[PDB]
Design an enzyme around this catalytic site. Structure first.
Site, PDB file in Angstrom:
ATOM      1  N   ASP A  32     -10.921  -4.059  -8.876  1.00 38.41           N
ATOM      2  CA  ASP A  32      -9.782  -3.710  -9.790  1.00 38.41           C
ATOM      3  C   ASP A  32     -10.272  -2.869 -10.964  1.00 38.41           C
ATOM      4  OD1 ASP A  32      -7.182  -4.032 -11.103  1.00 38.41           O
ATOM      5  OD2 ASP A  32      -6.855  -5.759  -9.864  1.00 38.41           O
ATOM      6  N   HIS A  62      -5.266  -5.444 -15.907  1.00 38.04           N
ATOM      7  CA  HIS A  62      -4.907  -5.809 -14.543  1.00 38.04           C
ATOM      8  C   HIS A  62      -6.017  -6.603 -13.861  1.00 38.04           C
ATOM      9  CE1 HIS A  62      -3.758  -5.021 -10.363  1.00 38.04           C
ATOM     10  NE2 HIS A  62      -2.572  -4.585 -10.705  1.00 38.04           N
ATOM     11  N   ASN A 153       4.424  -2.518  -3.885  1.00 38.06           N
ATOM     12  CA  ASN A 153       5.635  -2.755  -4.620  1.00 38.06           C
ATOM     13  C   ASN A 153       6.835  -1.822  -4.484  1.00 38.06           C
ATOM     14  OD1 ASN A 153       3.352  -3.555  -7.343  1.00 38.06           O
ATOM     15  ND2 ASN A 153       4.029  -5.050  -5.844  1.00 38.06           N
ATOM     16  N   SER A 215       0.440  -7.495  -6.484  1.00 37.26           N
ATOM     17  CA  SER A 215      -0.927  -7.454  -7.073  1.00 37.26           C
ATOM     18  C   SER A 215      -1.167  -8.864  -7.665  1.00 37.26           C
ATOM     19  CB  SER A 215      -1.240  -6.230  -7.929  1.00 37.26           C
ATOM     20  OG  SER A 215      -0.169  -5.380  -8.476  1.00 37.26           O
TER      21      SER A 215
END
Ligand SMILES: [Ca+2]
Ligand SMILES: [Ca+2]
Length: 269
Positions: A32, A62, A153, A215
């Site tokens: 990430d 994130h 998404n 996520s």
């Protein structure tokens, strides 16, 4: 004190914890934007694959969030992760913008394979297939790593890559009632779903924050995968995978849901 987010109860992590399953002795890579050091995190190591950037120093938030869900410490502060004793490595593949390049994602996957990681959490995706990606997805897997990837998404009745890949466990998101979250990509290659709406976790600047996204669902399964492996040390990636899907609570439509809700109690019986 410490709060236990709605998703960790939902996934039934505590029941596994009661039987002594903490994710101890398991190595988890988080591919990430990085992981920042935080009082409620234990980061064992990592590497950066971003031209221009540190590792654990997440300029986005994130990766820090993702890691919080898989393992923030069981103590009297902030939150509690699914696998509170899992060995976290920050594999920085996305920059502060939160974007990367397939090569950065591939070298991270190489890192995990060459470093002996049991789990690889990839909360990222692309509508586009990549040769360099499925290859690395592939080596990582021969090398014994379980790649966990987010569906995407867009809400499309199709799944993102690396998730589409047979070689990767694809994770979609549910909301608080156990209904698919509107953005959650479904279809072909969808292995299971986990809580992805209003998930509170660890965040840079030693604070906490709520985010939405497939996520956020991915870290929940990476977590479960760690509990099972602690309990069945001999098991391979493919075993943990099939048992995780097989012990899931069926939310009746494998197209929108794959196997159903990951379940730590059940998965650890
Ligand atoms: Ca905590
Ligand atoms: Ca898949």
């Amino acid at each position: 004190a410490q709060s236990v987010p709605w998703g960790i109860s939902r996934v039934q992590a505590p029941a596994a914890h009661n039987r002594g399953l903490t994710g101890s002795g398991v190595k988890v890579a988080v591919l990430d934007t990085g992981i920042s050091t935080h009082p409620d995190l234990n980061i064992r190591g990592g590497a950066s694959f971003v031209p221009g950037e540190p590792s654990t120093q997440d300029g986005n938030g994130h990766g820090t969030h993702v890691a919080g869900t898989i393992a923030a410490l069981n103590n009297s502060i902030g939150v509690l992760g699914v696998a509170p004793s899992a060995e976290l490595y920050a594999v920085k593949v996305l920059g502060a913008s939160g974007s990367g390049s397939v090569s950065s994602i591939a070298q991270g996957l190489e890192w995990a394979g060459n470093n002996g990681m049991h789990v690889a959490n990839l909360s990222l995706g692309s509508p586009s297939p990549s040769a360099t990606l499925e290859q690395a997805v592939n080596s990582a897997t021969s090398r014994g790593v379980l790649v966990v990837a987010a569906s995407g998404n867009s809400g499309a009745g199709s799944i993102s890559y690396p998730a589409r890949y047979a070689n990767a466990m694809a994770v979609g998101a549910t909301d608080q009632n156990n209904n698919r979250a509107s953005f959650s990509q479904y279809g072909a290659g969808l292995d299971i779903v986990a809580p992805g709406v209003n998930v509170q976790s660890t965040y840079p600047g030693s604070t906490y924050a709520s985010l939405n996204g497939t996520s956020m669902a991915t870290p929940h399964v990476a977590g479960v995968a760690a509990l099972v492996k602690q309990k069945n040390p001999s098991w391979s990636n493919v075993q943990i995978r099939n048992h995780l899907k097989n012990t899931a609570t069926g939310l009746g439509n494998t197209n929108l849901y794959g196997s159903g809700l990951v379940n730590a109690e059940a998965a650890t019986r």
